[PDB]
Design a protein around this nucleic acid. Structure first.
Ligand SMILES: [K+]
Ligand SMILES: [K+]
Ligand SMILES: [K+]
Ligand SMILES: [K+]
Ligand SMILES: [K+]
Ligand SMILES: [K+]
Ligand SMILES: [Mg+2]
Ligand SMILES: [Mg+2]
Ligand SMILES: [Mg+2]
Ligand SMILES: [Mg+2]
Ligand SMILES: [Mg+2]
Ligand SMILES: [Mg+2]
Ligand SMILES: [Mg+2]
Ligand SMILES: [Mg+2]
Ligand SMILES: [Mg+2]
Ligand SMILES: [Mg+2]
Ligand SMILES: [Mg+2]
Ligand SMILES: [Mg+2]
Ligand SMILES: [Mg+2]
Ligand SMILES: [Mg+2]
Ligand SMILES: [Mg+2]
Ligand SMILES: [Mg+2]
Ligand SMILES: [Mg+2]
Ligand SMILES: [Mg+2]
Ligand SMILES: [Mg+2]
Ligand SMILES: [Mg+2]
Ligand SMILES: [Mg+2]
Ligand SMILES: [Mg+2]
Ligand SMILES: [Mg+2]
Ligand SMILES: [Mg+2]
Ligand SMILES: [Mg+2]
Ligand SMILES: [Mg+2]
Ligand SMILES: [Mg+2]
Ligand SMILES: [Mg+2]
Ligand SMILES: [Mg+2]
Ligand SMILES: [Mg+2]
Ligand SMILES: [Mg+2]
Ligand SMILES: [Mg+2]
Ligand SMILES: [Mg+2]
Ligand SMILES: [Mg+2]
Ligand SMILES: [Mg+2]
Ligand SMILES: [Mg+2]
Ligand SMILES: [Mg+2]
Ligand SMILES: [Mg+2]
Ligand SMILES: [Mg+2]
Ligand SMILES: [Mg+2]
Ligand SMILES: [Mg+2]
Ligand SMILES: [Mg+2]
Lengths: 202, 56, 164, 85
RNA sequence: GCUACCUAAGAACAGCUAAAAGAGCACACCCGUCUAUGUAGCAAAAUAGUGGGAAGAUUUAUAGGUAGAGGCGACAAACCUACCGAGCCUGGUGAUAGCUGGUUGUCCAAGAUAGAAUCUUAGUUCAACUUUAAAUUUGCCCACAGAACCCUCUAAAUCCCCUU
RNA sequence: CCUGUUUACCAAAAACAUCACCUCUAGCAUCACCAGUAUUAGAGGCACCGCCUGCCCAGUGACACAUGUUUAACGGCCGCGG
RNA sequence: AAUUUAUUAAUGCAAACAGUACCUAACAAACCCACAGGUCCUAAACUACCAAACCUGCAUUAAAAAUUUCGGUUGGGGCGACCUCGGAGCAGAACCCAACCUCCGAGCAGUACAUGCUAAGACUUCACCAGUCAAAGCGAACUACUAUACUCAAUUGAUCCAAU
RNA sequence: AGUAAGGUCAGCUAAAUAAGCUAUCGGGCCCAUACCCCGAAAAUGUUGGUUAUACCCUUCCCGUACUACCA
């Protein structure tokens, strides 16, 4: 929106009288064009689960381009009106009372999606005898896969591992979604050595 | 116009009264420190050159 | 003030960080900012990673400090090397400077088997030692701290209380 | 439709200047009419609809002097007729 | 509806030479070189004679197109309804003009005036002069005394000035 | 050069146009150019033909970018003493 | 020539619009391990590229234009010269007095830092604007200082406006 | 008739510590000349004024340059 103001002062017209406009009052100076203002986010309430925005019932502030073109037209989100806000607020209150969420927070859904398609390389050093426990396994998630996993959430196959091979790890997110990820026990290599041998050569 | 030998400078009182007067000095000499009468204190006090006004 | 150097210092200050573990028990490191701050917990965690990633008990903890060794005035300061012996030297040590002058320094602090209190005391001496080049209060000198062992990743130490 | 001074100086020439809104083509769905319309709108129209929480609210809430569109008033009559009947 | 150029579809060009022709001679036809006449004329561009072209970039009838901040132009600043350095009509418009012309009954009276500023010396504004009314008091003419040294004209005079 | 054209109403000419020659721009379609396609089309100079069109890119302009290029573009093409 | 980019075109940013890429350089000196490799002497932290044109806004460079003007004096105008200020002659003695008349100069410099403030009465470049001289008084200086509105001829520029 | 501008080694240019080049003189080179090599010498048009001078101003003189138009 183009906003302009008159160079010349318009004489007062009084109560119930239209102002008298001379031809010099047509002279305008640009005050501000609103298209150059910084863009503001749009407040919406999600109805479905989005890959990165969030899940149903979450107040998300997204770009106006994203909300007006993708979320609103496809029904993924609705306006955060006071009526809509109260509805979803009551919805989550009933879900808490009924213990029927099983939907995960904004971060939890992304973790599950990553954990569905991933493989962990548990580098174990050959020289020193090693026994795999959920505390050790969760360490490799932070290093290799970059996932912070609570030690208690991990469920090892309960068979002690002292030899290199293939196993499975069960990962549970928020006590709701249980993900069984592949496990590959390979001889440990230093990351500076490993990156030189494979990434640099190929 | 190309010639330039003197400049016009402002002398400000050292008494802190804010009284100032303009004087003419040679461009190639050091800043002036003159004993000039200050109306606010009603006695002669030291004045120190602060800023050049123009070129004479 | 070079544009590239000032922007990088602006960007590192703008890196998000959070206190404490998130509500989710299992979460990606990409989804949440850094969480581990305490030096005492960092030393314990570095020893913990030694047990989990089976390695030698004694490890050189090469602390990396993202020190703002510039932007005192419009003219940035120049690198030097202030040598001060630590209260608990590992078995005067020079404070090296980056070849690329990217304002990060790699200096060994203490062995892994050393007690956390001794390691923390050594860290405090280094903080005063590195700031000795430009002890002026006009501009900040420390931005981020990353305490890493030889076989572990760094942790964003909460160095702000330890700055004075 | 107005006049401007060159370099914003009143001692310079007085030139003719016309400011035109940036027009965009957008598709809007009306819940009451159960139909989608391809309507030429500006960025301001999107903000007003967003502040009204929907096209249907925006058409009904906006007065005639603020809509500034015969099509907008025609949309209002269609929605009002369905609600009335 | 003139003219400039263009569009659609028409028309005209005898005879002779050569027979090939933006070829020659030469009617119709087109043009207007030279001279005389004419100059309120027959004519707001003509008449008479003499000339240029006359199968071609020709001439020409009809309808249409390009419109003035423009058109069109084998550039002559051509031509665009007799007057085009850019039409015409209406309106703004009772344009403006320091410039020119004009400015209507009777009678009497006073009345000719250093300069300064000015894109100003064809004009204005302020002084000066002139006019009217009013206030109250000296105005003019002038006796001595008095008003410069430097310097070649040792000028005619002036200023001041009571008396009258 | 020629035929031709021009100031209807004081100039018909050596002026303009012209075949020829040369420079510049453009790789392309459904209203001009054109229902065309670089042996083309448009913007210009000069003026058939014949012999020729010499030297100059510092400045100006245009073009091209790393220097630069171009005069059939605007234009220019020397002194003093013996 | 001054003023302007309204217009057109090109470019840049913003607006609007698609999303897509994913950051690696050890090396055991000692030791361990049948390998493959490990331990010790760093394994941190931390991202990137392209959204087509169209439209709109704001800039920039061009093109093509628009608006307006083209000073005076002057032995006619043009050309040349001149345009403000001061001294001298013309103008011999109060003042004043011209010529594109005869001559010489000025657009500063130097010394002070009370060249502080204030105030009778006057002069005045023929108006105005502007300019000039001043007793007393206040405050200083001063009982050596031709000391009290510097020396000097001109030695310069109104209003609006801008800087503070 | 007006106006502009220039006057510098013998010559021609540059700089105003008035230099370089050629010319000039002396020597060497060469049977000889020239080239060459070494070394020397050589000037502000003039008038006066510019603190004092020079590059400046100005007097005068030679040469140069442009303009001299409209009815
Ligand atoms: K007739
Ligand atoms: K017609
Ligand atoms: K006049
Ligand atoms: K003829
Ligand atoms: K060139
Ligand atoms: K005369
Ligand atoms: Mg009223
Ligand atoms: Mg009105
Ligand atoms: Mg035809
Ligand atoms: Mg015939
Ligand atoms: Mg013929
Ligand atoms: Mg006819
Ligand atoms: Mg004809
Ligand atoms: Mg014939
Ligand atoms: Mg018409
Ligand atoms: Mg014709
Ligand atoms: Mg002509
Ligand atoms: Mg002519
Ligand atoms: Mg007519
Ligand atoms: Mg009149
Ligand atoms: Mg007039
Ligand atoms: Mg009388
Ligand atoms: Mg004036
Ligand atoms: Mg007069
Ligand atoms: Mg008298
Ligand atoms: Mg008397
Ligand atoms: Mg013919
Ligand atoms: Mg004629
Ligand atoms: Mg004709
Ligand atoms: Mg004729
Ligand atoms: Mg010709
Ligand atoms: Mg061609
Ligand atoms: Mg010609
Ligand atoms: Mg030829
Ligand atoms: Mg040639
Ligand atoms: Mg060149
Ligand atoms: Mg304009
Ligand atoms: Mg644009
Ligand atoms: Mg106007
Ligand atoms: Mg003027
Ligand atoms: Mg004139
Ligand atoms: Mg005149
Ligand atoms: Mg004359
Ligand atoms: Mg002249
Ligand atoms: Mg006298
Ligand atoms: Mg007199
Ligand atoms: Mg007077
Ligand atoms: Mg006194």
């Amino acid at each position: 929106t183009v906003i302009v103001e008159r160079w010349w002062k318009v004489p007062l017209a009084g109560e119930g009288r239209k102002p008298r406009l001379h031809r010099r009052h047509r002279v305008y100076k640009l005050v501000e064009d609103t298209k150059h203002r910084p863009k503001e986010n749009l407040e919406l309430i999600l109805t479905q689960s989005v890959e990165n925005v969030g899940v149903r019932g979450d107040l998300v502030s997204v770009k106006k381009s994203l909300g007006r073109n993708r979320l609103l037209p496809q029904g993924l989100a609705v306006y955060a009106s006071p009526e809509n806000k109260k509805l979803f607020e009551e919805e989550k209150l009933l879900r808490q009372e009924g213990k029927l969420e099983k939907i995960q927070t904004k971060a939890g859904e992304a973790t599950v999606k990553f954990l569905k398609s991933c493989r962990l390389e548990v580098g174990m050093k050959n020289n020193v005898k090693w026994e795999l426990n959920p505390e050790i396994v969760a360490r490799h998630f932070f290093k290799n896969l970059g996932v912070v996993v609570a030690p208690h959430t991990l469920k090892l196959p309960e068979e002690p591992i002292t030899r290199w091979g293939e196993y499975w790890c069960e990962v549970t997110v928020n006590g709701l979604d249980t993900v069984r990820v592949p496990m590959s026990v390979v001889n440990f290599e230093k990351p500076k050595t490993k990156r030189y041998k494979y990434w640099l050569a190929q | 116009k190309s010639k330039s030998k003197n400049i016009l400078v402002r002398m400000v009182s050292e008494a802190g009264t804010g009284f100032c007067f303009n004087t003419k000095r040679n461009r190639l000499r050091e800043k002036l420190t003159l004993l000039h009468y200050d109306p606010v204190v009603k006695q002669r006090v030291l004045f120190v050159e602060k800023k050049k006004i123009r070129s004479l | 003030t070079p544009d590239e150097k000032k922007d990088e210092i602006e960007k590192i200050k703008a890196y998000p960080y959070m206190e404490g573990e998130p509500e989710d028990d299992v979460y990606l490191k990409r989804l949440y900012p850094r969480q581990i701050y305490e030096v005492e917990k960092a030393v314990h965690l570095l020893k913990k990673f030694q047990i989990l990633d089976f390695t030698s008990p004694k490890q050189s903890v090469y602390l990396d400090l993202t020190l703002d060794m510039a932007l005192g005035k419009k003219k940035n300061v120049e690198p030097f090397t202030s040598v001060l012996s630590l209260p608990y030297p590992f078995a005067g040590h020079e404070i090296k400077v980056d070849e690329e002058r990217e304002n990060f320094l790699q200096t060994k602090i203490a062995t892994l088997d050393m007690s956390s209190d001794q390691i923390a005391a050594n860290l405090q001496a280094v903080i005063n030692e590195v700031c000795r080049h430009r002890p002026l209060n006009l501009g900040p000198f420390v931005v981020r701290a990353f305490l890493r062992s030889s076989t572990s990743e760094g942790l964003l130490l909460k160095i702000d209380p330890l700055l004075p | 439709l107005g006049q401007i001074y060159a370099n914003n100086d009143k001692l310079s020439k007085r030139l003719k200047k016309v400011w035109k809104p940036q027009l965009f083509e957008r598709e809007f769905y009306s819940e009451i009419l159960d139909k989608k319309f391809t309507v030429t709108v500006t960025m301001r129209t999107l903000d007003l609809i967003d502040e009204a929480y929907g096209l249907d609210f925006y058409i009904l809430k906006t007065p005639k002097e603020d809509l500034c569109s015969k099509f907008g008033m025609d949309l209002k009559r269609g929605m009002l007729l369905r609600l009335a009947r």
